[model samples]
Target: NDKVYENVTGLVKAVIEMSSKIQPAPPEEYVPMVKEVGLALRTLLATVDETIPALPASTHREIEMAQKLLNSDLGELISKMKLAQQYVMTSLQQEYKKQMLTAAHALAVDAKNLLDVIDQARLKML
Candidate 1:
């Protein structure tokens, strides 16, 4: 019984590990892959927060009430998240701007890919 759960859990573990790989000296060939995942994740998550309404007949009353309370500032939430992501990316770029730093871009790519995979995994379960 536990083995079934373990196999599914392993993918999550892998993604979590992958997310922090920015600190490492990732191989040149793999750099693009990494940044793509990050950027994709950032895009998808922000979109989910802003545009995705809870599914019909699947929405809990409590969650609906909470969404109503925060509906006025949903745009602000999305904006802030984008700003924070950009700030991190820009900071990385500025650190190595003189030496042809591909790190920030690569990070974006990898993050997006990983996020896409994770989203697939989540939706598969649903």
Candidate 2:
């Protein structure tokens, strides 16, 4: 009845998808987008690392690649955004990503609702 499999599966897929978009270069005007990518990636990866076990054997390489992309891109993005004095946008991305990852965790937990109910019933009958 452990629904961790489903949760991890969804998280892994999302991380991979989001990771690709966290590119290193973009137009100077789109620095906000770049920063958002990095902040989102870090939030996602950190949440995933804390939540998922067995990652080292099953998904470490991909996650590591995502982390690398996030770090480099985030640094560059922050530099540009700060230089442009778009502090509000930069701060919002960090906050937004934090909230999003928390929401993702809630979603993962919610995904197990039916499973949890079924499991509880099974246990009670036993």
Candidate 3:
């Protein structure tokens, strides 16, 4: 469980770092990276949901709120994700850094915000 949680945040940090380097690399793979992360999210919840039914036995409120928080924050991430990819595409097409940062900033903050809740959830597991 704890190891899985490690992967959760570790993978996210990877995304952030990966995105930071996107400017130097070919932007052709940006959307594919985004898709990979999104799929990772789906895979995590699938496993977590199956395994987490037991968590309510001890302290449920925090975990429940974590789930709730997950959705709310992810809602914002999803929105930024759309804009991020859109801007990423156009910016890459035009080789524009201004809008590229716009999209990156929007996506990064939301992702970071979600990580806090996720970090909280991870500590609760410990």
Error of 2 at 122 (Å): 27
- For candidate 3, write residues 1-126 as lDDT tens digits: 364465456546645665676566545655565565556555555545655554434544554554455455445544554554556576454444334445444544444454455455556666
Best by TM-score: 3
TM-score of each: 0.24, 0.33, 0.50
Rank by lDDT, descending? Answer: 3, 2, 1
Total residue pair clashes for candidate 1: 22
Which lDDT tens digits does candidate 1 get at residues 43-102?
A: 434443443343333333333343333332333333333333344466653343312223
Q: Distance (Å) between predicted and true CA of 12, model 1?
A: 1.7
Best-to-worst ranking by TM-score: 3, 2, 1
Tens digits of per-residue lDDT, candidate 2, 76-105, equal 435544533333365665554444344333
Question: What is candidate 3's CA lDDT for residue 35?
Answer: 60
Mark the 10 consecutive residues where model 1 has the least summed lDDT.
Answer: 96-105
- Lowest summed lDDT across 10 adjacent residues in model 3 is found at 92-101
As a whole number from 0 to 100, the lDDT of residue 121 in candidate 3 is 55
Residue 32 Cα positional deviation in candidate 3, in Å, after optimal superposition: 1.2
Clashes of 3: 0
